[PDB]
Amino acid sequence: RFASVYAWNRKRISNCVADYSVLYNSASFSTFKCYGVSPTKLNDLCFTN
Amino acid sequence: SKVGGNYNYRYRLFRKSNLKPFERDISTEIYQAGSKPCNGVEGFNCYFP
């Protein structure tokens, strides 16, 4: 179940290795948009939270 | 500048690899940004450059 916009989930993720390739190369999604950083190099660039 | 829209000014959004100095490029081949082969004019991860 996914809650609607009344109470939007704010899941916290840290202390793990993130493989964005699976979500990046999956046909089970409708739209995938972001210009803040090129989605190709998401995996190499690290993050904190 | 024209109020009706002088959108003949076109530019490259992205390229497969960076070009050497003073290397003009005119190709308009559709670039593929995913594992799937780029088929047809348009497709998933297939955008006009």
From Swiss-Prot, chain B:
Q: What result follows from mutating F48L?
A: Increased resistance to neutralizing antibodies and human covalescent sera neutralization
Q: What does the annotation give as the result of altering E42K?
A: In strain: Beta/B.1.351, Eta/B.1.525, Theta/P.3, Iota/B.1.526, B.1.1.318, Gamma/P.1, Zeta/P.2 and Mu/B.1.621; May enhance affinity to human ACE2 receptor
The effect annotated for F44P is: In strain: Omicron/XBB.1.5, Omicron/EG.5.1
Which residue stretches belong to region Disordered?
A: 13-48
> Which residue ranges does the record annotate as region Receptor-binding motif?
1-49
Phenotypic consequence of S35N: In strain: 20A.EU2, Iota/B.1.526, Omicron/BA.1, Omicron/BA.2, Omicron/BA.2.12.1, Omicron/BA.2.75, Omicron/BA.4, Omicron/BA.5, Omicron/BQ.1.1, Omicron/XBB.1.5, Omicron/EG.5.1
Give the start-end ranges of region Immunodominant HLA epitope recognized by the CD8+: 6-14
Origin superkingdom: Viruses
Task: Provide the disulphide bond pattern.
Answer: C38-C46
Result of changing E42A: In strain: Omicron/BA.1, Omicron/BA.2, Omicron/BA.2.12.1, Omicron/BA.2.75, Omicron/BA.4, Omicron/BA.5, Omicron/BQ.1.1, Omicron/XBB.1.5, Omicron/EG.5.1
Q: How does the annotation summarize its subunit structure? A: Binds to host ACE2. RBD also interacts with the N-linked glycan on 'Asn-90' of ACE2. Cleavage of S generates a polybasic C-terminal sequence on S1 that binds to host Neuropilin-1 (NRP1) and Neuropilin-2 (NRP2) receptors. Interacts with host integrin alpha-5/beta-1 (ITGA5:ITGB1) and with ACE2 in complex with integrin alpha-5/beta-1 (ITGA5:ITGB1). May interact via cytoplasmic c-terminus with M protein. May interact (via N-terminus) with host bilirubin and biliverdin, thereby preventing antibody binding to the SARS-CoV-2 spike NTD via an allosteric mechanism.
Q: What does this protein do?
A: Attaches the virion to the cell membrane by interacting with host receptor, initiating the infection. The major receptor is host ACE2. When S2/S2' has been cleaved, binding to the receptor triggers direct fusion at the cell membrane. When S2/S2' has not been cleaved, binding to the receptor results in internalization of the virus by endocytosis using host TFRC and GRM2 and leading to fusion of the virion membrane with the host endosomal membrane. Alternatively, may use NRP1/NRP2 and integrin as entry receptors.
Instruction: Return the protein name.
Output: Spike protein S1
Taxonomic source organism:
Severe acute respiratory syndrome coronavirus 2 (2019-nCoV)
Q: Which gene encodes it?
A: S
